[PDB]
């Protein structure tokens, strides 16, 4: 079960409990692949004993960090280290003292899902896109069952590997992805994650359009309050859009659970015609 590392009196102690310390000499930084909240994100490789090198992403904590930043940065590792599922990004380990501070994660060659789909706009069949959504739902089902509420589920936080497997990422600690009760009353639960999941479905079926396009945050909020919901994207079957609508139920208890979502998508894969009903 998920342990919130901020329940520890010393959060540094949780890092060492859940994340393997790595020798910096075994980490090769090859290229800068992104900017993070805390420092550059790089691709490279990690040398493991007896094994061929594994390709990794390396999140750096930029030099000159405070203790608070180090703590906040490493919290991601102390959370990610607790998980083991095919659709959740795997933690290789961390470098926390004595050498440049880093979190080392499995390399996802194709990067963030929203950018990936924008690049490959119109190149995936409904069944392929549904397969991606099913992977994300299976990752979320696992997390919800572990007692973990994500809060920032969005296509930009889903990573895609060279085999097109989609995995949940971003375990550190927005409006248009967030359930109304979470925006207004800070009630974040797995049911508000299901609302976010609905938005992710729409992002996927639209090949990475911005939810609600150019509407302002305030206009999104008001629209949702009046019963507005985003339409089926081009080529999106009606049944799949109905599942989005179900994720966006005003009353959180009426939204499907992730287990139900997985089942529904599996049925659309086995019987693709049923995606229209």
Swiss-Prot record:
Cellular localization per UniProt: Cell membrane
Modified residues annotated as Phosphotyrosine in this record: 2, 8
PTM remark: Phosphorylated.
Domain Protein kinase: from-to ranges: 27-269
Catalytic residues identified in the record: 152
Binding residue positions for ATP: 33-41, 59
Segments in the Cytoplasmic topological domain: 1-274
Tissue-level expression: Widely expressed.
Protein's job: Receptor tyrosine kinase which binds promiscuously GPI-anchored ephrin-A family ligands residing on adjacent cells, leading to contact-dependent bidirectional signaling into neighboring cells. The signaling pathway downstream of the receptor is referred to as forward signaling while the signaling pathway downstream of the ephrin ligand is referred to as reverse signaling. Among GPI-anchored ephrin-A ligands, EFNA5 is a cognate/functional ligand for EPHA7 and their interaction regulates brain development modulating cell-cell adhesion and repulsion.
Family classification: Belongs to the protein kinase superfamily. Tyr protein kinase family. Ephrin receptor subfamily.
Quaternary assembly: Heterotetramer upon binding of the ligand. The heterotetramer is composed of an ephrin dimer and a receptor dimer. Oligomerization is probably required to induce biological responses. Interacts (via PDZ-binding motif) with GRIP1 and PICK1 (via PDZ domain).
Descriptive protein name: Ephrin type-A receptor 7
Gene: EPHA7
Shown chain mapped onto the complete sequence: 607 to 899 of 998
